[PDB]
């Protein structure tokens with residue numbers, strides 16, 4: 001209880017202090033799911049623990065060009081023991097089991113023990129390679145061959161794994177209505193903290209009945225709506241606005257149990273108003289009241305309590321019963337158009353009647369019609385709702401990508417949302433992690449705590465630690481926000497109770513980030529007193545302290561749950577001399593190599609925009625690979641850990657265009673005055689065949705990021721926000737604003753063109769391939785246009801300044817040219833590409849001028 005409180009960032013006593021039945025019932029119900037997960041873990045013993053927690057990834061497929069990629073048809077592996085620094089480099093056949101590495105390494109140690117009492121652990125990662133499967137089948141070995149990198153293994157004794165297993169097990173063991181013809185009416189009585197009130201009923205975006213306006217001024221007025229209690233839907237929204245805007249508040253007609261509310265209800269209104277409003281009201285806003293204890297604007301309203309027995313919404317059996325009581329020239333081309341429309345598009349009364357009349361044709365011929373079919377009714381009639389609900393169970397499961405649309409603002413109904421999550425159960429954990437950022441923000445829109453989405457997100461987080469660690473930080477970053485403090489807190493409590501063993505891993509992360517927050521605050525104060533040379537020494541002395549060293553070393557990274565952050569390389573650790581003073585942390589490598597694991601800590605700066613942009617870059621790279629196009633994208637890890645605080649993954653051996661132009665140390669740059677610095681920089685670290693691979697990796701990565709920055713609208717591009725890795729790969733950094741909210745044209749510079757053409761101006765064939773590559777990448781992105789719109793629609797409740805209303809997503813439709821045909825959309829892209837080429841030297845000047853006005 002006390003251990004959970006400190007970890008989640010909210011006291012468990014705070015939930016009991018609220019005295020709310022919804023909060024108490026959710027905590028009770030989720031405890032049953034948490035305790036059942038504990039009981040399933042104690043049943044499993046020995047090797048079965050690793051087979052569930054960290055299973056070895058394997059594929060039975062065959063690899064292309066296997067003979068040339070292998071060292072004489074054999075794998076070369078580097079292996080060392082837990083306490084021994086001596087690495088053993090030897091050849092192992094790919095067809096043999098991982099036990100062959102175990103026996104060949106112990107024999108080398110015996111010359112200068114049984115192989116069965118040893119397990120293979122991936123270098124600097126909580127990943128394991130074991131089983132009666134060939135070595136070529138394993139994913140870590142497979143990736144090593146493709147990326148050319150040599151596989152590094154650490155032999156961990158079975159007794160040490162047993163010691164790790166038993167210690168966790170001790171902590172796990174320690175857990176021991178429709179008949180009512182009367183119209184709907186509410187009484188407006190008093191506005192407490194006021195410095196007329198408009199009322200209206202909504203069901204997503206749709207207006208259920210005509211809006212009601214109160215007399216201009218204490219009110220004591222009966223506001224009667226043009227709808228009956230029988231016709232009211234389950235997830236009906238009652239919106240209020242005081243105005244000229246003063247205060248707005250939203251409330252639910254039916255509670256979490258499904259009962260029609262009766263009696264006096266106090267509603268704490270909000271001060272901030274959005275730019276876009278529907279009928280002078282905000283139906284897009286949350287139904288949660290202002291948590292400010294007697295300080296914010298309060299609106300007192302009285303629900304009809306004159307009823308003898310409290311009436312609930314009809315149960316599932318009663319809904320289908322009414323649907324059966326109702327039941328017992330076709331225009332296909334015009335229906336096909338409506339069905340093919342994007343999620344942002346609105347439907348007309350005449351269009352809605354067409355889908356409703358052709359509901360049987362929609363059910364039998366087009367399963368993709370359901371999102372449009374659910375919006376074909378106004379939900380202001382019980383007959384229309386019951387018939388639609390009956391068609392919902394007999395409807396086949398939609399693909400997970402199309403299912404995500406049924407979770408936005410347009411679909412508030414419980415049964416509709418229960419179907420959507422059911423379709424998302426079909427996808428794997430790897431697929432779920434891609435859309436995990438969007439699903440967490442849907443919980444903010446969710447009116448009640450106990451929903452199908454919260455139950456499913458917890459079920460997957462408990463079964464998989466990679467999903468679990470990510471969900472933990474997604475909720476903990478907004479746990480201090482009063483608007484979602486109660487909602488995000490109970491989900492965090494439910495996960496920690498069901499994963500007592502993972503709490504130790506999460507505790508080390510919370511403790512490490514707290515020291516980072518302290519170190520960031522110390523430099524902010526010492527900035528006006530100490531110099532740059534003295535300030536760097538002050539940071540090194542602070543990190544060398546026993547309190548800082550023990551807290552930041554030997555723990556799993558919050559960005560990547562596998563990667564282990566070892567001892568900190570104090571000498572390479574630095575900080576930026578900017579207002580927010582971000583920290584740069586470099587971790588020491590192990591006995592094998594290796595590329596030093598880097599992590600950037602940023603405090604005071606919002607990283608929610610960076611998280612969304614890199615998630616889109618990951619999705620773009622995934623959709624391109626499905627078409628058979630690997631553009632060698634580098635969408636690095638970014639995770640918001642707290643309020644205006646987060647972490648950034650460092651891409652090893654990479655420098656900005658500005659750093660490449662301002663030659664580091666003493667390199668042969670005289671070309672002269674470091675002319676065409678990008679090509680000369682790549683020539684220094686890549687020679688012969690490797691240089692050709694570096695040019696190829698540059699032209700593919702440049703093409704991908706040029707299309708990505710044009711589509712997403714990533715503006716303010718210069719020499720400091722574009723980085724180049726030593727392997728050739730080009731990538732964008734520091735994503736401040738999105739969707740042209742910094743409109744944004746296609747950007748291309750001569751520095752890139754010089755690399756693609758390999759220095760020769762008459763090498764048009766290479767640039768022609770790059771131009772067609774940009775054109776190809778843009779057309780693949782157009783096919784999945786509806787998916788990109790869906791993902792941005794679910795992020796409207798996140799609280800981003802650039803993304804507030806549906807009008808902000810309109811930029812994405814224009815950039816992808818979804819309104820134009822495939823022919824005119826490419827012609828629009830080509831026009832912008834040719835404009836970027838004609839302004840390539842102008843872009844080169846503006847970026848070089850930016851490099852000049854520094855220090």
Ligand SMILES: C[C@H]1Cc2ccccc2N1C(=O)Cc1nc(N2CCOCC2)cc(=O)[nH]1
Nearest residue numbers: 574575576582583584636649650651733734
């Ligand atoms: C200006 C650089 C140098 C520096 C020194 C100390 C602390 C922070 C930073 N900097 C940054 O914070 C820039 C910066 N770098 C980023 N990178 C992520 C990919 O690997 C390379 C680094 C991502 C990002 O959003 N911003």
